[PDB]
Design a protein around this ligand. Structure first.
Ligand SMILES: Cc1c(CN2CCC(Nc3ncnc4sc(CC(F)(F)F)cc34)CC2)ccc2c1cc(C#N)n2C[C@@H]1CNC(=O)CO1
Length: 468
């Protein structure tokens, strides 16, 4: 349109007015992605990018939003000539989807920082011709909606986005980049990534959005950061209000990371009358088990982060052990570096800091430590084992660093008499290792004295010692 009914709430004068606009669109046949993203982007522009407004909330006048909306839709409609792409009866062709992706891609500024903040929305695309990676995929979907292509939907993994189209969403197409300067796979399917068991494509258990999940995505995509020290509290509150609206309407049911995002917000600002963060984290894991075969990593990472912030050492290590149990059924590929870096920091920064604080109290003489709990030691081992198994599914190993020095250190935080209580059982607390690297370490892990050189040899597959 804009249709008449889409315009009656303007001007938007408050974050509550924005929520009413999302509620109205979520009540329609198909919520208007372009309208909603433009509004979120406009508000974020004046609360996070250029804070020049003279009122608390940057009043959103219909004349401004309508002009931006008409600019987008006319750009897309003028550049994508549907007459050239006969549609098979509610089915978009791969050429048509590629054409929409090319129109978005070719409109982007030739040079900018692609990981800058606040370039996620259609407001940034229209005013700045800049988008970040997943913002390109979202803009393709909004453009397809504007063109009447009801079968084109956003597909989301835990670190990438693309589109699905055709009957039941059976065709996939890459429409944006991943990482930096990698392949130009635009227009290809994701079948190779699915078949290779790379985490980036979730073995095919990725999210296939309907339009209301596409609204949930843009709300998660809100970035309240003003700088590295300061968030906009008004943006955070808007994002939290919008996530509760989607929650109430049932649209986070199949969106684990949105439930974790909402829990993280509730931790900073508990909404009176709403469930606790811990309930939300477990709902996210429950969603991942129900809809995605328990193939997602972040539901457990959200939970581990919570337990870590609250110093529940046992429960953090349990959640990290669960994260590794998910990752072990993937095969490491270079495109998976983002989750690799997260595991690397957990192993080499987060866990050492937690166990160091535990060790200091225990050294003073205080009993009942997590360091005295063989279930805790077993979770630490399962965490390493899953990461090793993941790596073993790759082609070329050589994953240096972090791993050996802090593995040895973390092992030594537990006394021999605790480590010795874990039973490591082969198939065909109790632990079964899946990785060949940890299977070979079993007797080194329960020695009274941790043999640092032998453990490093085994973890690095180094076969030789210093000549002298
Ligand atoms: C909680 C959390 C976050 C937050 N993060 C979670 C994923 C969210 N993503 C998305 N959210 C919603 N929709 C989509 S859709 C999509 C794909 C698309 F973008 F392509 F679209 C992505 C995406 C973005 C916010 C980061 C690192 C975390 C944790 C917890 C832990 C631990 N334990 N860690 C590891 C760190 C390592 N180093 C440390 O110091 C401390 O722990």
């Amino acid at each position: 349109g804009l249709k008449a009914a889409q315009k009656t709430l303007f001007p938007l004068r408050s974050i509550d007015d924005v929520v009413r606009l999302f509620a109205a669109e979520l009540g329609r046949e198909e919520p208007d992605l372009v309208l909603l993203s433009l509004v979120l982007g406009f508000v974020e522009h004046f609360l996070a990018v250029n804070r020049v407004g003279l009122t608390y909330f940057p009043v959103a006048d219909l004349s401004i939003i309508a002009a931006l909306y008409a600019r987008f839709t006319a750009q897309i409609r003028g550049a994508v000539d549907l007459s050239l792409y006969p549609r098979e009866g509610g089915v978009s062709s791969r050429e048509l989807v590629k054409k929409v992706s090319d129109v978005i891609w070719n409109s982007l500024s030739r040079s900018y920082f692609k990981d800058r903040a606040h370039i996620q929305s259609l407001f940034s695309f229209i005013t700045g011709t800049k988008l970040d990676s997943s913002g390109v995929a979202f803009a393709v979907v909004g453009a397809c909606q504007a063109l009447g292509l009801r079968d084109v939907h956003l597909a989301l993994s835990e670190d990438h986005a693309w589109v699905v189209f055709g009957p039941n969403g059976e065709q996939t197409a890459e429409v944006t980049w991943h990482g930096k300067g990698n392949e130009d796979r635009r227009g290809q399917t994701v079948n190779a990534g699915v078949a290779e068991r790379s985490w980036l494509y979730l073995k095919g258990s990725y999210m296939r959005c309907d339009r209301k999940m596409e609204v949930a995505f843009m709300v998660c995509a809100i970035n309240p950061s003003i700088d590295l020290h300061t968030d906009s509290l008004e943006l955070l509150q808007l994002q939290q209000k919008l996530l509760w609206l989607l929650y109430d309407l049932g649209h986070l049911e199949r969106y684990p990371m949105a439930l974790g995002n909402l829990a993280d917000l509730e931790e900073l600002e508990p909404t009176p009358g709403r469930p606790d963060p811990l309930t939300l984290y477990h709902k996210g894991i429950a969603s991942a088990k129900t809809y995605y075969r328990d193939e997602h990593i972040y539901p457990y990472m959200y939970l581990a982060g919570y337990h870590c912030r609250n110093r529940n050492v046992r429960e953090a290590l349990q959640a990290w052990a669960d994260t590794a149990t998910v990752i072990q059924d993937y095969n490491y590929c270079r495109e998976d570096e983002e989750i690799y870096k997260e595991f690397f920091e957990v192993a080499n920064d987060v866990i050492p800091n937690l166990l160091k604080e535990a060790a200091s109290l225990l050294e003073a003489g205080s009993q009942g430590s997590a360091l005295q709990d063989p279930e805790c030691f077993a979770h630490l081992l399962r965490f390493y084992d899953g990461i090793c198994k993941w790596e073993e599914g790759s082609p070329t190993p050589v994953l240096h660093v972090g791993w050996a020095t802090f593995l040895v250190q973390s092992l030594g935080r537990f006394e021999g008499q605790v480590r010795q209580k874990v039973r490591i059982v082969s198939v065909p607390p109790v632990l079964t290792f899946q990785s060949e690297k940890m299977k070979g370490m079993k007797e080194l892990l329960v020695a009274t004295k941790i043999n640092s050189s032998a453990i490093k040899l085994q973890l690095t597959a180094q076969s030789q010692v210093q000549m002298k």
